[PDB]
Enzyme design. Structure first.
Site, mmCIF file in Angstrom:
data_model
loop_
_atom_site.group_PDB
_atom_site.id
_atom_site.type_symbol
_atom_site.label_atom_id
_atom_site.label_comp_id
_atom_site.label_asym_id
_atom_site.label_seq_id
_atom_site.Cartn_x
_atom_site.Cartn_y
_atom_site.Cartn_z
ATOM 1 N N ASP A 8 0.819 -1.173 0.000
ATOM 2 C CA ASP A 8 0.000 0.000 0.000
ATOM 3 C C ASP A 8 0.876 1.256 0.000
ATOM 4 O OD1 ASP A 8 -2.435 1.627 0.314
ATOM 5 O OD2 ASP A 8 -1.971 1.630 2.421
ATOM 6 N N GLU A 10 -0.392 5.015 0.885
ATOM 7 C CA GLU A 10 -0.674 5.953 1.984
ATOM 8 C C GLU A 10 -0.680 5.222 3.320
ATOM 9 O OE1 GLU A 10 -3.869 7.275 -0.715
ATOM 10 O OE2 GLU A 10 -3.615 9.173 0.377
ATOM 11 N N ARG A 47 -15.084 15.638 -2.459
ATOM 12 C CA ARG A 47 -13.747 16.202 -2.378
ATOM 13 C C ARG A 47 -13.524 17.081 -3.594
ATOM 14 N NH1 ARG A 47 -10.613 10.591 -0.426
ATOM 15 N NH2 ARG A 47 -10.135 11.304 1.703
ATOM 16 N N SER A 91 -2.758 0.881 -4.575
ATOM 17 C CA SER A 91 -3.294 2.048 -3.847
ATOM 18 C C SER A 91 -4.623 2.479 -4.386
ATOM 19 C CB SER A 91 -2.285 3.182 -3.933
ATOM 20 O OG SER A 91 -2.838 4.401 -3.385
ATOM 21 N N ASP A 92 -5.464 3.071 -3.538
ATOM 22 C CA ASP A 92 -6.709 3.637 -4.038
ATOM 23 C C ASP A 92 -6.592 5.135 -4.346
ATOM 24 O OD1 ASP A 92 -8.453 1.300 -4.164
ATOM 25 O OD2 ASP A 92 -8.564 1.361 -2.017
ATOM 26 N N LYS A 134 -7.112 -4.017 -5.178
ATOM 27 C CA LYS A 134 -5.869 -4.515 -4.625
ATOM 28 C C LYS A 134 -5.907 -6.039 -4.588
ATOM 29 C CE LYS A 134 -5.331 -0.514 -1.611
ATOM 30 N NZ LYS A 134 -4.456 0.043 -0.549
ATOM 31 N N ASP A 153 -1.762 -0.852 5.866
ATOM 32 C CA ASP A 153 -1.916 -0.248 7.198
ATOM 33 C C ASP A 153 -3.344 -0.122 7.649
ATOM 34 O OD1 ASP A 153 -2.297 1.894 5.239
ATOM 35 O OD2 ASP A 153 -2.289 3.315 6.855
ATOM 36 N N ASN A 156 -9.053 -1.229 4.487
ATOM 37 C CA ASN A 156 -9.128 -1.339 3.024
ATOM 38 C C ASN A 156 -7.951 -2.118 2.392
ATOM 39 O OD1 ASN A 156 -6.993 0.692 2.790
ATOM 40 N ND2 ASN A 156 -7.946 1.459 0.908
HETATM 41 MG MG LIG Z 1 -2.227 4.467 8.554
HETATM 42 MG MG LIG Z 2 -3.004 3.016 3.526
#
Ligand SMILES: [Mg+2]
Ligand SMILES: [Mg+2]
Ligand SMILES: [Mg+2]
Ligand SMILES: [Mg+2]
EC number: 3.1.3.3
Lengths: 206, 206
Positions: A8, A10, A47, A91-92, A134, A153, A156
């Site tokens: 991942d 972020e 957003r 990653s998203d 993913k 992390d 998701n």
């Molecule tokens: Mg985190």
């Molecule tokens: Mg993440």
């Protein structure tokens, strides 16, 4: 013995981009995540509304993201990992949003989503590449006979971690660690290295 | 839409590795080709035997290959490509032979085969990941909804190129160029860049 390390982005290698963007611009509204708004299609609609309301075009947005940095230790970790594995980022995020940060990581292959940009450089839309992207990426590597070791992390990431041959939680919140005891949970880059070494079928050095 | 650039390694970014390695050693017996021994398994078995007879362990082999460099202009071209595409390298060589060259390109993702290395660092066998590995890698990225633009230099690369949404021949032999007119044929990095721009669905700069 043919292994791909899937990471991942972020929270593993770079900060959460929208929260960091909000911190840089003072736009508190953008600190909002799925913990506040579950439906990514809605959150992305929103957003983009806020960005347009602040007159922030793509070039403006990229200027801000260019001031962000990888997490402390993240570049060294990626360098270590690339000496030992093929490294693919799952990653998203969006290509056009994450580009300045990806450059600082040496542009490892990134599998993520895209934005829709008009002739006036406005962010009007987005396209999710596919559902459960993913997990589906892990399946694609399995089709090529790779063993996949994945680290993430957050919630998701758990489908990716479950699908992989070995999954590792890095910097995960306590709720996630407690809900997913099947994955080792570590919080330093050195420990993350050691979990990659444990998961690998090969004899590798730290 | 979302585009992966797949590059063949040898002949596109780096010299033919085995041949260059064998020349650098000065050991004539290492120079046998698929012309001399058309059965690849028999050829590889012979190579491993001769390596062993000359005491060339993996570390020795990699020290020699580490004196090779990417083709002139290849470093810049890979960097240029990574600004514009997700880059994946496809190859029919072995991870252990390519590693010292990949390091010089910033370790882009490489999908290839693997050697079997014993506890004494001797090369004791090899494993092909799967049949038609480059073509199958293109299929994997298509399963994730990517458009694929591929470049290669050889007849065997044509399965990969035909599988891609757009194929480009780079430093290809006349026979390949003329038998496959559907792939634009170029022989400088600047022209290769231009063919990637032409094949892209996106508006990209040189
Ligand atoms: Mg985190
Ligand atoms: Mg993440
Ligand atoms: Mg080639
Ligand atoms: Mg060639």
């Amino acid at each position: 013995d043919m292994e791909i390390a899937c990471l991942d982005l972020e929270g593993v290698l770079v900060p959460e981009i929208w929260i960091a963007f909000a911190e840089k611009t003072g736009i508190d509204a953008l600190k909002a995540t799925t913990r506040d708004i579950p439906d990514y299609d809605v959150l992305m609609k929103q957003r983009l509304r806020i960005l347009d309301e602040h007159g922030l075009k793509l070039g403006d947005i990229q200027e801000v993201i260019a001031t962000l940095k990888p997490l402390e230790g993240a570049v060294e970790f990626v360098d270590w990992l690339r000496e030992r594995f093929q490294v693919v980022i799952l990653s998203d995020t969006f290509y056009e949003f994450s580009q300045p940060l990806m450059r600082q990581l040496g542009f490892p292959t990134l599998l993520c989503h895209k934005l829709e940009i008009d002739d006036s450089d406005r962010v009007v839309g987005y396209q999710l590449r596919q559902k459960d992207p993913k997990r589906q990426s892990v399946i694609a590597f399995k089709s090529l006979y790779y063993r996949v070791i994945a680290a993430g992390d957050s919630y998701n990431d758990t489908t990716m971690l479950s699908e992989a041959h070995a999954g590792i939680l890095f910097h995960a919140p306590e709720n996630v660690i407690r809900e997913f005891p099947q994955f080792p949970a570590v919080h330093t880059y050195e420990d993350l290295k050691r979990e990659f070494l444990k998961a690998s079928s090969r004899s590798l050095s730290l």
